[PDB]
Amino acid sequence: PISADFSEVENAPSFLSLAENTDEVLKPYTGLEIQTIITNIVGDANPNQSRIFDQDRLRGNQYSAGGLVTQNAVSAIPFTNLIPRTIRVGNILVNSANRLQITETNVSEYYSNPIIATKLSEMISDQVKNNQFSTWRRDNTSLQGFNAFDIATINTAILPNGLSLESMLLKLSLLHSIKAMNVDAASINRSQYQVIDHNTVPTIGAPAVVGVNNSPVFGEDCGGNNPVYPFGGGTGAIAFHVTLQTVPDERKSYAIFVPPAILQATSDANEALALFALSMSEWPHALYTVTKQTTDLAGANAGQQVFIPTQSTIHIGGRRVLDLIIPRREIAPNPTTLVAANAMCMVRPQAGPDATAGAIPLAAGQLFNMNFIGAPAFEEWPMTSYLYSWAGRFDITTIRQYMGRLATMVGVKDAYWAAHELNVALSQVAPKMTTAAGGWAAQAANSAQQSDVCYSSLLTVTRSAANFPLANQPAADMRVYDTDPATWNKVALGLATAANLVPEQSMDVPFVVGDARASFWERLQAIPMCIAWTMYYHSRGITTLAWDNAYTDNTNKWLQKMVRNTFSTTQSVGTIIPARYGKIVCNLYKNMFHRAPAYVATSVGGKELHITHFERWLPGGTYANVYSGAGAVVNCFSPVLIPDIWCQYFTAKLPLFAGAFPPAQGQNSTKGFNSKQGLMIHRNQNNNLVAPYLEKFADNSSYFPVGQGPEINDMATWNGRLWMTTGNVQYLDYSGAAIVEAVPPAGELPVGKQIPLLAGENAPIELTNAATTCVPRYSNDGRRIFTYLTTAQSVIPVQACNRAANLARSCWLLSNVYAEPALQALGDEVEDAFDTLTNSSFLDVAKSVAES
Amino acid sequence: PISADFSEVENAPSFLSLAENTDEVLKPYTGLEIQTIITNIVGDANPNQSRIFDQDRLRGNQYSAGGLVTQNAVSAIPFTNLIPRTIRVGNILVNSANRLQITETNVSEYYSNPIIATKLSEMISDQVKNNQFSTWRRDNTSLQGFNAFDIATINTAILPNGLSLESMLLKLSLLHSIKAMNVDAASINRSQYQVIDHNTVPTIGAPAVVGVNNSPVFGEDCGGNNPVYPFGGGTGAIAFHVTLQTVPDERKSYAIFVPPAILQATSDANEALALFALSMSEWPHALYTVTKQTTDLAGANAGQQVFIPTQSTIHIGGRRVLDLIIPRREIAPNPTTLVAANAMCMVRPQAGPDATAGAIPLAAGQLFNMNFIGAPAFEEWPMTSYLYSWAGRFDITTIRQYMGRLATMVGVKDAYWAAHELNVALSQVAPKMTTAAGGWAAQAANSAQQSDVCYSSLLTVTRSAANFPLANQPAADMRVYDTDPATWNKVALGLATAANLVPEQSMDVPFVVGDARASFWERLQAIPMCIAWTMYYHSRGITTLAWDNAYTDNTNKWLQKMVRNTFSTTQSVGTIIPARYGKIVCNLYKNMFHRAPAYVATSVGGKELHITHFERWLPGGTYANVYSGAGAVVNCFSPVLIPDIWCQYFTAKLPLFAGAFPPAQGQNSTKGFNSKQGLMIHRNQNNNLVAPYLEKFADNSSYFPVGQGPEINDMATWNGRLWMTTGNVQYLDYSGAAIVEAVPPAGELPVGKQIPLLAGENAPIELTNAATTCVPRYSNDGRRIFTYLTTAQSVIPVQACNRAANLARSCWLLSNVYAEPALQALGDEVEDAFDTLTNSSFLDVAKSVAESAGEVPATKALTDLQAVDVSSLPSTSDPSNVLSQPAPLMSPPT
Amino acid sequence: AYTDNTNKWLQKMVRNTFSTTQSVGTIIPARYGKIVCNLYKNMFHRAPAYVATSVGGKELHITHFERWLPGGTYANVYSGAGAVVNCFSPVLIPDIWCQ
Amino acid sequence: DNSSYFPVGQGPEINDMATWNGRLWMTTGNVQYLDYSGAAIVEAVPPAGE
Amino acid sequence: RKSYAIFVPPAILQATSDANEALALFALSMSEWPHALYTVTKQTTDLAGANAGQQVFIPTQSTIHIGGRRVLDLIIPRREIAPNPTTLVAANAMCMVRP
């Protein structure tokens, strides 16, 4: 919460108090209630637009350090999933000059929740034991549509591993979040088309079109009509079979049964079939491309403009070839002639409306010729071509139908929610901040720095270095479980079950899917994740080089252990073991928001263990760093992405070092902590260098002792912010010499991204739109860092810490923060009559809030 | 009430006593409290027989300060909704020089009463799960003429919020409020046409005509016969579908089902479809007009004036285009061919009886060409033109039956009543006051000041700055709930239910919905609202220029709070939260009128809270101010809208500072409070300025301390009124310096609007029709304001405070009466003999339906028997429960 | 009474003569059709055919008296030379049949 | 209170004997269908005595 | 079309002297009505008996509209315990009655 008075600063929680474990079960933090913070804002200059197209921004009144007022100043929402591929330059569309982003994943086996045999599979094995010949006769088949010999052979295997549905549901969530873009233009806010490209203004009149393989540059098209995998290249292969007798051996163990429940899940069974086929092959099968009409800032230069969705770039699975088995209409022995095969099956697979040109061209809507036992030549299709035909017909309400059916056949409530969490955590992305003295800045148009971007985890994204298809050495970003085809076959036939596979009412599918607001809710759900990682990284002052070099040669002992426990270093078989210090981040999340992240159960040694997206990232990335104007990299600060007001304003509780500065010109304006709090100044007056009250040294005064680093102390960080927020901070060491990290041109601090204004809005003023909490304490050399001011500059702030003076700093006028008059002609403290008449009600509201 | 003696004003309740929280249940304010006082009609009467065309004034005898009695003195009913677009000028009717008023709404989703899935949905899920054993794609799940694949997708992924229905009911109520003008002239007030145009006279014999897009000036016709939306400037689109498949992928998620339960009348059902379509598209779809015959004050010159209803200019945002998915007549395979479709649609839509031009021209009565798979081309209509054609065909009596069937599906009683409260709050409107010495005044004809107007909340109404269609959106004035298509689809098909949505009888529809008297009755419901807001703003002394700049100013910390807390701009747990000081006005209302305002619930984490229309206004507007006789603005007063006789003759109980001056009775007349009351006189360096007994803190604050402002004190306010009501007050600083705010020409007070007289009436005299209570105390720059008199002028009033002298005053000669509530139900109804012959059967069949929401005679115990594998049915492993809020628990840590 | 020129009382009056109500999968009987069935049973000492129907678990008989639909036009007398006259309440048959 | 206009929402009450008397007036050859003041009603009427 | 198809039990086909007629009557029984406009014709004459002739009348029952389902698939019993027919002669000889 933002603060009206300095009394609200002193009484704030300490960091260790919030990093503490909490026992109580909580609730998911859906974007539907994060929605209400952007709307329902204080301010009289604000037209309260109803369309979600305009509700994309943090609007508010602001108050200057000099005591002036500014109305309806703006702060852009940081996150997006769209990467531009046609940047405007000189007010005209121009082909991009920068290579595409990429993500990877280490899929893992899921041994947790091993399956139990049904009484059906039990009696089947008994019949195999006692050698009951009749039960697997040649022409016996179930109403399911599969013949008995196949069931008797699928049952014979013993499997240790359980079933997951994680990568499956994850691919469905990714396709969903791509298809959501195609919904009404009013249902999608414009800020999302102008986070990376600040010179572009989308049109409300015409919907974004969702194409595929249309990118202009760097081999992005992946062959067009001839579709090919973006990752590694090549075409896959697909074959439809009525029986496992037909599938080639050395291929049999891999073949997947397709239950009838899948094929009756939609208006067009070939489409449900195609969507299941997408569901268990490699992703992306192609590069999807959102296209949108946009115009000039003056409206002068309209045109279509291309965007590549982030979801389209993540790489998961990658199984290349697949054999699908299908139900049959009639109780008949396995087909021998071709016509007897084609007429036999429940549905006859075919390409969708879009055509393809390849060595194996597919005419639009072409029928597939089913395989049979006596066939002179085995039959097969290219996979990327196959899915390419149907790439145009997936649709979010159809996916909704499909999901209701899956929810009915087997549980989907929780797993889809966790998969959705992974989707947000991986596919939401913000540009690195540029440094400035004022409220707004951005990097020059069509530049490598314009397109640098980071995860919510404050890890920079990997960027491709060559034309598609890529042929990389893998660099996985985080673990996920794999969906096992064999266990799926054991379950689809009623042969087996698992403790989390319980069937559910269709109405229980989580409400996100099939809803057109889903994109906006994605963007919103991304912010709290950054708040938890940010408060993790800012509590200790480690510089961005000290993290970047912490997994390479320039490491310390302490940086070694430090990077080691942030991430999922550990690798037990068939498991994902959580980071030791990811738990602290989950605690911060639960204490600062009174809500909880999605869990996945996982067992080790018979011990149960929850795991969250906080606990399953992988080490070796590069961290967020600020740029200088003119693009020079600077990496002194601890890593950052987003402006302080987001942190201060969405949280219910925050640690003391992070609070907003109270408004200028009041009694109880910003102050500081001194000797009584147990702090001590470091003077260096011989060189004009004076530094705040700080923690008493513990043999760590100039070099830290080996294996140790800076200690948590809020009040000292607060003082460091007070020194920084003056205009001339100087980052030196104990002797007053330069440190190895690059430093901002003097007085600059990182600041939020510029976007074009609407009518009646203002650019943010002063330090209202800036990171401030990013204070250095530990350099890559192992030395301490000190923030200095000259002896003359340093006198007022020292009086403030001493509490014999006040300081003047700018602030948002939101909630209970009111502007302070220059005089302060105070009267006797007096409760207002209206405040007493309406106090109980005000208590009832707060009680209702606490209850939840 | 009016006071009889000074003993009664001296014993009147304090303001804080009336603003206390009250815990008792109270009946709705039907507006008939005012009817039995200003009208012949005590009890019932037929509207035709009563001539309420002439029942449009406050009447009575008046007593003057000089001792004379003026019989048959009169006062106008302040409020209206009609806006002239042609003003009489120089006895000759002419085009308006001034642009039209506009209004904006902030529509949005909020948590409502918690929602739960029904038994019918469980049966459907079990039908699907059981269907999974057989390689047959089959259609067991069809309901009410809908495709089996559609019921499956309407049964998925429910939204926690709940369901509202409010914006729907707003659009319906606004429409009704407009069509109610269409009834005969005998039962609409004469005054209603002449609140703003005081020089015109309506003719009783001929009814008003309601048209569309007819206006002469500023492009008000929205393309005329070829229409466009008045605000967006665009044109909509509408398409009808037998099944959801034919809907383009760009918008399959926004589709709305049109349940068969409406259209069950043998009354034209093609119109009921149009009125379902109207209540979910953007409003207004066109600018309605009321044309009425009128004449000159001499009766000499006659003509047809044009008016715009205030309901027709308020913008409820929403959906330009609609896919309406129609029920199938006969259960059947999906109509792959056309003749299978049309001969099987339960209704086949066609345009209403009016022609339209432009692209996609529509001949009258034209038939829509149905959409089905494999069709040669897609077909749709512009919706502005489709709605333009039915626009002349709706009427009060059909809206009543429509809503009567609508009530059978979902309860609509309390929700509609609250929507009607919003209707009255946003549509009733009054002109700004003119200062004078005497009892009447009005602004010059066809002037900008003549047409300037305000809400019952003392906030001004904004004007358009360019010809329609408007190129750019105005700021929101108030925020309302929205109605989700998704959970609408779930609720209409019986798949979901909430405690606010329990079905009701067609007789439960509130009386206003049917009657021709409804316009008059809406006109009477806005007065208590101003009385509440007036007592609120007048309890403190803050001036108009001071409210006007308050939200931002840095001169004083207290003032910023005092405005920030009166508007609804706060939230928690994803829902709206009521304005903190709106509750004061609500309490003030309940305590003065002994009636309860209509409210709606918001669920904060499952805890319901009541929001009233007092609590949902938004910042931005200018506040209400009086004009000089010459048209110059006057800033110095607190906000005012109406003469105080209205405030003080229609309240059961009243604040002390606002009571009427008592009648002369022998020696006694009027009197003032002194130091025995805790008060004390202000004096300065000047020896020729005297200010009344006031607070003791008044001695120590030429400027209020920051964080503090003037406090409630009835008696000092009373004394301030005594200084003001002398003909020669002076508005000045602690030192006797001029304040920055514009002040009236000397000795003048704001006074109520002039209207033409009937034979035998007299104009109000002196201060009988003035506002008096608006006593300034807080200046724009933080100074106190003092009311001064010169010494010689000062002597009699001070002795009147000392109870040793008396001050003459005028009064109405009216006694006090205040009725117990006329009706409990909120709906009129009378037993007929047949209602008694057939009583018990109705009484239990009714209750047997109210519990029957989402029930079918087949129970789970029967449909289990048909199931293949009962343990694996989701209804077994998932007994259903009410969803929690903000969201139901997911992924619990074991 | 089912078109524009309606009253309140004509509104309720036509509303309860007929089967206005529409619960799912059912035909709910008119409130005042029951009076007509009572007249039938008292004046003839005989009963009309029933169909059972359930709502809310409540049983409900229904008869052709209870299942007509609103919006028709009523019997009216003609003048000689064919002029329509509609002052009388609706009629079809001579009194002696009734008596 | 239903002498010339019925009060809103109410209509004529059942009373047999009055209907009997109305039949007695009708079965004479010259009945005249008017209102309380003796003015014509809006319904079309039979040529006299029919 | 499968979910709509109606089985015709043998009980229907042995309900009359000509099974094709019972079949036709069941088919009338579950499709749309009227399937045509039936016409009663009767000789009539003048009041004086002067002008005899046939005269046409349309029954009221023929004008009521009910149902209206348009297309129908009827399933029929087979004479012998045999697997589903594959040749045409094997189909025609198979069924209980040939429509």
PDB file of N, CA, C and O in Angstrom, chain A residues 516-552:
ATOM      1  N   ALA A 516     -13.226 -14.419 -23.842  1.00  0.00           N
ATOM      2  CA  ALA A 516     -12.495 -13.506 -24.708  1.00  0.00           C
ATOM      3  C   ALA A 516     -11.612 -12.525 -23.958  1.00  0.00           C
ATOM      4  O   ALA A 516     -10.772 -11.867 -24.555  1.00  0.00           O
ATOM      5  N   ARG A 517     -11.807 -12.431 -22.650  1.00  0.00           N
ATOM      6  CA  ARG A 517     -11.022 -11.531 -21.814  1.00  0.00           C
ATOM      7  C   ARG A 517      -9.709 -12.150 -21.397  1.00  0.00           C
ATOM      8  O   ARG A 517      -8.925 -11.515 -20.709  1.00  0.00           O
ATOM      9  N   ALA A 518      -9.474 -13.386 -21.816  1.00  0.00           N
ATOM     10  CA  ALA A 518      -8.396 -14.191 -21.269  1.00  0.00           C
ATOM     11  C   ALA A 518      -7.028 -13.569 -21.440  1.00  0.00           C
ATOM     12  O   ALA A 518      -6.181 -13.719 -20.578  1.00  0.00           O
ATOM     13  N   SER A 519      -6.816 -12.840 -22.526  1.00  0.00           N
ATOM     14  CA  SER A 519      -5.523 -12.215 -22.768  1.00  0.00           C
ATOM     15  C   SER A 519      -5.181 -11.149 -21.731  1.00  0.00           C
ATOM     16  O   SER A 519      -4.067 -11.086 -21.192  1.00  0.00           O
ATOM     17  N   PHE A 520      -6.173 -10.319 -21.457  1.00  0.00           N
ATOM     18  CA  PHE A 520      -6.079  -9.244 -20.494  1.00  0.00           C
ATOM     19  C   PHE A 520      -5.839  -9.794 -19.096  1.00  0.00           C
ATOM     20  O   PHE A 520      -5.010  -9.292 -18.336  1.00  0.00           O
ATOM     21  N   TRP A 521      -6.518 -10.882 -18.783  1.00  0.00           N
ATOM     22  CA  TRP A 521      -6.327 -11.546 -17.518  1.00  0.00           C
ATOM     23  C   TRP A 521      -4.946 -12.160 -17.422  1.00  0.00           C
ATOM     24  O   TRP A 521      -4.385 -12.247 -16.340  1.00  0.00           O
ATOM     25  N   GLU A 522      -4.389 -12.570 -18.557  1.00  0.00           N
ATOM     26  CA  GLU A 522      -3.020 -13.083 -18.587  1.00  0.00           C
ATOM     27  C   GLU A 522      -2.041 -11.993 -18.186  1.00  0.00           C
ATOM     28  O   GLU A 522      -1.197 -12.170 -17.285  1.00  0.00           O
ATOM     29  N   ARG A 523      -2.183 -10.845 -18.848  1.00  0.00           N
ATOM     30  CA  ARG A 523      -1.306  -9.718 -18.581  1.00  0.00           C
ATOM     31  C   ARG A 523      -1.376  -9.331 -17.127  1.00  0.00           C
ATOM     32  O   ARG A 523      -0.359  -9.076 -16.501  1.00  0.00           O
ATOM     33  N   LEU A 524      -2.586  -9.286 -16.586  1.00  0.00           N
ATOM     34  CA  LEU A 524      -2.751  -8.911 -15.194  1.00  0.00           C
ATOM     35  C   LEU A 524      -2.150  -9.922 -14.245  1.00  0.00           C
ATOM     36  O   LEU A 524      -1.526  -9.550 -13.265  1.00  0.00           O
ATOM     37  N   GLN A 525      -2.328 -11.203 -14.528  1.00  0.00           N
ATOM     38  CA  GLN A 525      -1.812 -12.232 -13.631  1.00  0.00           C
ATOM     39  C   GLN A 525      -0.301 -12.237 -13.598  1.00  0.00           C
ATOM     40  O   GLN A 525       0.301 -12.753 -12.662  1.00  0.00           O
ATOM     41  N   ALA A 526       0.314 -11.707 -14.648  1.00  0.00           N
ATOM     42  CA  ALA A 526       1.769 -11.599 -14.666  1.00  0.00           C
ATOM     43  C   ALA A 526       2.374 -10.657 -13.615  1.00  0.00           C
ATOM     44  O   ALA A 526       3.467 -10.918 -13.144  1.00  0.00           O
ATOM     45  N   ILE A 527       1.696  -9.568 -13.245  1.00  0.00           N
ATOM     46  CA  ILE A 527       2.290  -8.582 -12.321  1.00  0.00           C
ATOM     47  C   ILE A 527       2.691  -9.092 -10.914  1.00  0.00           C
ATOM     48  O   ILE A 527       3.834  -8.876 -10.484  1.00  0.00           O
ATOM     49  N   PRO A 528       1.785  -9.775 -10.191  1.00  0.00           N
ATOM     50  CA  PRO A 528       2.203 -10.250  -8.869  1.00  0.00           C
ATOM     51  C   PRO A 528       3.412 -11.183  -8.864  1.00  0.00           C
ATOM     52  O   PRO A 528       4.185 -11.189  -7.893  1.00  0.00           O
ATOM     53  N   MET A 529       3.579 -11.961  -9.925  1.00  0.00           N
ATOM     54  CA  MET A 529       4.745 -12.829 -10.051  1.00  0.00           C
ATOM     55  C   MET A 529       6.036 -12.020 -10.014  1.00  0.00           C
ATOM     56  O   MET A 529       6.988 -12.347  -9.287  1.00  0.00           O
ATOM     57  N   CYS A 530       6.053 -10.933 -10.777  1.00  0.00           N
ATOM     58  CA  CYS A 530       7.163  -9.999 -10.700  1.00  0.00           C
ATOM     59  C   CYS A 530       7.315  -9.348  -9.370  1.00  0.00           C
ATOM     60  O   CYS A 530       8.419  -9.009  -8.995  1.00  0.00           O
ATOM     61  N   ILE A 531       6.227  -9.116  -8.658  1.00  0.00           N
ATOM     62  CA  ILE A 531       6.395  -8.485  -7.363  1.00  0.00           C
ATOM     63  C   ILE A 531       7.141  -9.422  -6.422  1.00  0.00           C
ATOM     64  O   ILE A 531       8.064  -8.998  -5.733  1.00  0.00           O
ATOM     65  N   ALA A 532       6.798 -10.704  -6.439  1.00  0.00           N
ATOM     66  CA  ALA A 532       7.500 -11.643  -5.572  1.00  0.00           C
ATOM     67  C   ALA A 532       8.969 -11.831  -5.971  1.00  0.00           C
ATOM     68  O   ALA A 532       9.858 -11.831  -5.100  1.00  0.00           O
ATOM     69  N   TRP A 533       9.259 -11.957  -7.266  1.00  0.00           N
ATOM     70  CA  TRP A 533      10.669 -12.080  -7.621  1.00  0.00           C
ATOM     71  C   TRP A 533      11.454 -10.811  -7.338  1.00  0.00           C
ATOM     72  O   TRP A 533      12.585 -10.875  -6.865  1.00  0.00           O
ATOM     73  N   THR A 534      10.840  -9.663  -7.579  1.00  0.00           N
ATOM     74  CA  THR A 534      11.485  -8.388  -7.314  1.00  0.00           C
ATOM     75  C   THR A 534      11.832  -8.225  -5.848  1.00  0.00           C
ATOM     76  O   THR A 534      12.940  -7.832  -5.510  1.00  0.00           O
ATOM     77  N   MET A 535      10.903  -8.554  -4.962  1.00  0.00           N
ATOM     78  CA  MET A 535      11.203  -8.386  -3.551  1.00  0.00           C
ATOM     79  C   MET A 535      12.229  -9.407  -3.117  1.00  0.00           C
ATOM     80  O   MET A 535      12.889  -9.223  -2.112  1.00  0.00           O
ATOM     81  N   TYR A 536      12.337 -10.513  -3.848  1.00  0.00           N
ATOM     82  CA  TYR A 536      13.425 -11.449  -3.572  1.00  0.00           C
ATOM     83  C   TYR A 536      14.779 -10.839  -3.902  1.00  0.00           C
ATOM     84  O   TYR A 536      15.666 -10.784  -3.063  1.00  0.00           O
ATOM     85  N   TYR A 537      14.933 -10.363  -5.127  1.00  0.00           N
ATOM     86  CA  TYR A 537      16.211  -9.822  -5.566  1.00  0.00           C
ATOM     87  C   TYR A 537      16.653  -8.509  -4.938  1.00  0.00           C
ATOM     88  O   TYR A 537      17.842  -8.229  -4.886  1.00  0.00           O
ATOM     89  N   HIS A 538      15.707  -7.688  -4.502  1.00  0.00           N
ATOM     90  CA  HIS A 538      16.032  -6.387  -3.931  1.00  0.00           C
ATOM     91  C   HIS A 538      16.405  -6.408  -2.457  1.00  0.00           C
ATOM     92  O   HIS A 538      16.985  -5.455  -1.963  1.00  0.00           O
ATOM     93  N   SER A 539      16.080  -7.484  -1.748  1.00  0.00           N
ATOM     94  CA  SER A 539      16.391  -7.557  -0.325  1.00  0.00           C
ATOM     95  C   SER A 539      17.884  -7.613  -0.076  1.00  0.00           C
ATOM     96  O   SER A 539      18.383  -7.088   0.915  1.00  0.00           O
ATOM     97  N   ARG A 540      18.594  -8.253  -0.994  1.00  0.00           N
ATOM     98  CA  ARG A 540      20.045  -8.302  -0.972  1.00  0.00           C
ATOM     99  C   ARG A 540      20.555  -7.525  -2.168  1.00  0.00           C
ATOM    100  O   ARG A 540      19.953  -7.559  -3.225  1.00  0.00           O
ATOM    101  N   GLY A 541      21.675  -6.840  -2.023  1.00  0.00           N
ATOM    102  CA  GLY A 541      22.058  -5.838  -2.991  1.00  0.00           C
ATOM    103  C   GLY A 541      22.930  -6.303  -4.128  1.00  0.00           C
ATOM    104  O   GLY A 541      23.614  -5.498  -4.740  1.00  0.00           O
ATOM    105  N   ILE A 542      22.928  -7.597  -4.396  1.00  0.00           N
ATOM    106  CA  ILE A 542      23.840  -8.178  -5.367  1.00  0.00           C
ATOM    107  C   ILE A 542      23.634  -7.543  -6.735  1.00  0.00           C
ATOM    108  O   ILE A 542      22.515  -7.402  -7.185  1.00  0.00           O
ATOM    109  N   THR A 543      24.718  -7.174  -7.399  1.00  0.00           N
ATOM    110  CA  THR A 543      24.633  -6.468  -8.668  1.00  0.00           C
ATOM    111  C   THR A 543      24.282  -7.431  -9.776  1.00  0.00           C
ATOM    112  O   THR A 543      24.368  -8.636  -9.597  1.00  0.00           O
ATOM    113  N   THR A 544      23.839  -6.903 -10.909  1.00  0.00           N
ATOM    114  CA  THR A 544      23.490  -7.734 -12.055  1.00  0.00           C
ATOM    115  C   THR A 544      24.682  -8.490 -12.677  1.00  0.00           C
ATOM    116  O   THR A 544      24.504  -9.604 -13.157  1.00  0.00           O
ATOM    117  N   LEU A 545      25.894  -7.932 -12.661  1.00  0.00           N
ATOM    118  CA  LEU A 545      27.057  -8.740 -13.036  1.00  0.00           C
ATOM    119  C   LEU A 545      27.327  -9.871 -12.084  1.00  0.00           C
ATOM    120  O   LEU A 545      27.848 -10.902 -12.480  1.00  0.00           O
ATOM    121  N   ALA A 546      27.038  -9.673 -10.816  1.00  0.00           N
ATOM    122  CA  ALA A 546      27.375 -10.705  -9.871  1.00  0.00           C
ATOM    123  C   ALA A 546      26.425 -11.882 -10.031  1.00  0.00           C
ATOM    124  O   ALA A 546      26.756 -12.991  -9.639  1.00  0.00           O
ATOM    125  N   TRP A 547      25.254 -11.662 -10.623  1.00  0.00           N
ATOM    126  CA  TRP A 547      24.374 -12.777 -10.956  1.00  0.00           C
ATOM    127  C   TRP A 547      24.680 -13.351 -12.330  1.00  0.00           C
ATOM    128  O   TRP A 547      24.621 -14.554 -12.524  1.00  0.00           O
ATOM    129  N   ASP A 548      24.992 -12.488 -13.287  1.00  0.00           N
ATOM    130  CA  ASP A 548      25.329 -12.965 -14.618  1.00  0.00           C
ATOM    131  C   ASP A 548      26.588 -13.818 -14.653  1.00  0.00           C
ATOM    132  O   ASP A 548      26.684 -14.746 -15.449  1.00  0.00           O
ATOM    133  N   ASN A 549      27.553 -13.511 -13.797  1.00  0.00           N
ATOM    134  CA  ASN A 549      28.809 -14.252 -13.778  1.00  0.00           C
ATOM    135  C   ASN A 549      28.828 -15.312 -12.700  1.00  0.00           C
ATOM    136  O   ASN A 549      29.873 -15.846 -12.378  1.00  0.00           O
ATOM    137  N   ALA A 550      27.668 -15.604 -12.130  1.00  0.00           N
ATOM    138  CA  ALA A 550      27.577 -16.487 -10.979  1.00  0.00           C
ATOM    139  C   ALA A 550      27.472 -17.949 -11.363  1.00  0.00           C
ATOM    140  O   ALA A 550      27.444 -18.823 -10.499  1.00  0.00           O
ATOM    141  N   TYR A 551      27.407 -18.219 -12.659  1.00  0.00           N
ATOM    142  CA  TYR A 551      27.243 -19.582 -13.130  1.00  0.00           C
ATOM    143  C   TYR A 551      28.308 -19.865 -14.185  1.00  0.00           C
ATOM    144  O   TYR A 551      28.342 -20.928 -14.788  1.00  0.00           O
ATOM    145  N   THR A 552      29.160 -18.864 -14.358  1.00  0.00           N
ATOM    146  CA  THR A 552      30.298 -18.897 -15.252  1.00  0.00           C
ATOM    147  C   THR A 552      31.542 -18.792 -14.384  1.00  0.00           C
ATOM    148  O   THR A 552      31.483 -19.011 -13.174  1.00  0.00           O
TER     149      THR A 552
END
